[PDB]
Design a protein around this ligand. Sequence first.
Ligand SMILES: *[C@@H]1O[C@H](CO)[C@@H](O[C@@H]2O[C@H](CO)[C@@H](O[C@@H]3O[C@H](CO)[C@@H](O)[C@H](O)[C@@H]3O)[C@H](O)[C@H]2NC(C)=O)[C@H](O)[C@H]1NC(C)=O
Ligand SMILES: *[C@@H]1O[C@H](CO)[C@@H](O[C@@H]2O[C@H](CO)[C@@H](O)[C@H](O)[C@H]2NC(C)=O)[C@H](O)[C@H]1NC(C)=O
Ligand code: NAG
Lengths: 225, 97, 112
Amino acid sequence: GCDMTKKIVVQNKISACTMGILNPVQLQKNYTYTIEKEAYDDDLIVFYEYKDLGCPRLVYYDKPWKPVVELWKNGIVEEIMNAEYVISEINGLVTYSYSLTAATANCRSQPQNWSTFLWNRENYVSCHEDNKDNPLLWPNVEYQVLGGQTNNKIIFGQRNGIYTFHLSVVDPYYSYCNLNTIFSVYVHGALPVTKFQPLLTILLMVTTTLLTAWLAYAIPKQLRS
Amino acid sequence: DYTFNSTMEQNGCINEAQTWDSMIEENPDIPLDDVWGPQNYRPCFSYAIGKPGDLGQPYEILNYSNKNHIKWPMTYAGMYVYRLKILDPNYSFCNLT
Amino acid sequence: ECQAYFRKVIKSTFFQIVMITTVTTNSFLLVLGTNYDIQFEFFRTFEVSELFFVSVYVCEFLMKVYVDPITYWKDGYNILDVIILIILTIPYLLRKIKGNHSAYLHFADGIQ
Ligand SMILES: *[C@@H]1O[C@H](CO)[C@@H](O[C@@H]2O[C@H](CO)[C@@H](O[C@@H]3O[C@H](CO)[C@@H](O)[C@H](O)[C@@H]3O)[C@H](O)[C@H]2NC(C)=O)[C@H](O)[C@H]1NC(C)=O
Ligand SMILES: *[C@@H]1O[C@H](CO)[C@@H](O[C@@H]2O[C@H](CO)[C@@H](O)[C@H](O)[C@H]2NC(C)=O)[C@H](O)[C@H]1NC(C)=O
Ligand SMILES: *[C@@H]1O[C@H](CO)[C@@H](O)[C@H](O)[C@H]1NC(C)=O
């Protein structure tokens, strides 16, 4: 059966703290952060806990990143974890995309996604077998499974907030243990966009029209002289 | 006027510990003998017990397997009669000073 | 017809002073944007100033889109500044509103 001494840990070799963004000395007393109405549909609000989580990982926007997980027995590092695993959001946000959408990953059996209902070693049957009666209704449906022999990652959004990734080891041949963990990342983006429907070309043509109006106004300035 | 080898860091203490000054302010009127001891010890290497405080203050939980030495101001000459007490909660049944 | 008056206006020192002021405020924008706080927060001033700067540069290119290219095709500083205008206008046109395929950002401080 399961071996109870095993556990999974996500590395935090450099954290967002101990520099000019956030300090560890302040977060534990209700340092609560904001959700900009992007999880499901209003005024959502998230409470980070330092004692449960600590100083979260730091990542940047539009960077192909995967978490690297280690297997621990009796509190001892022994081997990094290599099997297929999935991530999810407890808050329920969708503001992050995935890598290559299972087509270049050579999937062939219509891979199931985060819409079938909780994923674990029981419910999961892979898409790299040769199951015969559901080949594809799939040009480019994404591949919500990381690790393993594929090389797909998460591209991050521009929300500029903290994420609580609920990670589950998924392969049913690594162990009988339902290996599950919860870890925290924080994105640091570049620039939000508030340009709306006025485009750069639209403002350009507005400026050209205004400048031609100024020229047509300054023509009588020469005419009267 | 006394300090030691090292600071709160460079000793592996992930979180905030308790120092002599902190425990003296913790105990308002009781004498210095009952201020600290094995009945009130909590480790610095905790991540779950006391505090994520600032790191860099002088560290006095000195022991073996640590190099922690004592230090006095260089200028004036004086004497400081110290009594040494073991802080471990589960070493022996009695008081050893 | 009115080309003489247009050249008199462009020889007037007030337009040069205004455009120098706009690009010096652009230099200060780059100085504040090399930081991280003003890069994406407290940046409404950054947005409106950048819109003003690109409007001014579009006006300068509209002044250089005259028949003067007959001299701006063989001279010294002139070909340099019109080429600078072209390789300024095109990259932020495909960057600020991109909607396209690209690797990453490496020509923001370069454009500034
Ligand atoms: C999660 O996986 C399921 C498969 O179990 C996906 O359902 C399938 O999605 C594809 C592409 O979205 C559908 O093919 C196309 O659907 C569109 C309508 O959206 C239609 O116009 C095309 O002609 C073509 O049929 C396919 O029909 C659909 N199958 C079923 C049974 O629903 C689903 O899209 C995946 N969702 C995510 C978020 O990955
Ligand atoms: C505290 O001061 C002592 C000086 O007594 C330093 O002790 C040295 O430590 C190194 C490292 O193990 C040894 O190789 C030396 O032999 C020690 N010398 C002596 C005289 O003890 C110690 O490095 C200081 N601690 C810190 C953190 O700086
Ligand atoms: C934050 O939460 C803790 C415990 O959940 C509570 O003691 C504290 O008063 C809260 N602070 C604020 C500002 O809500």
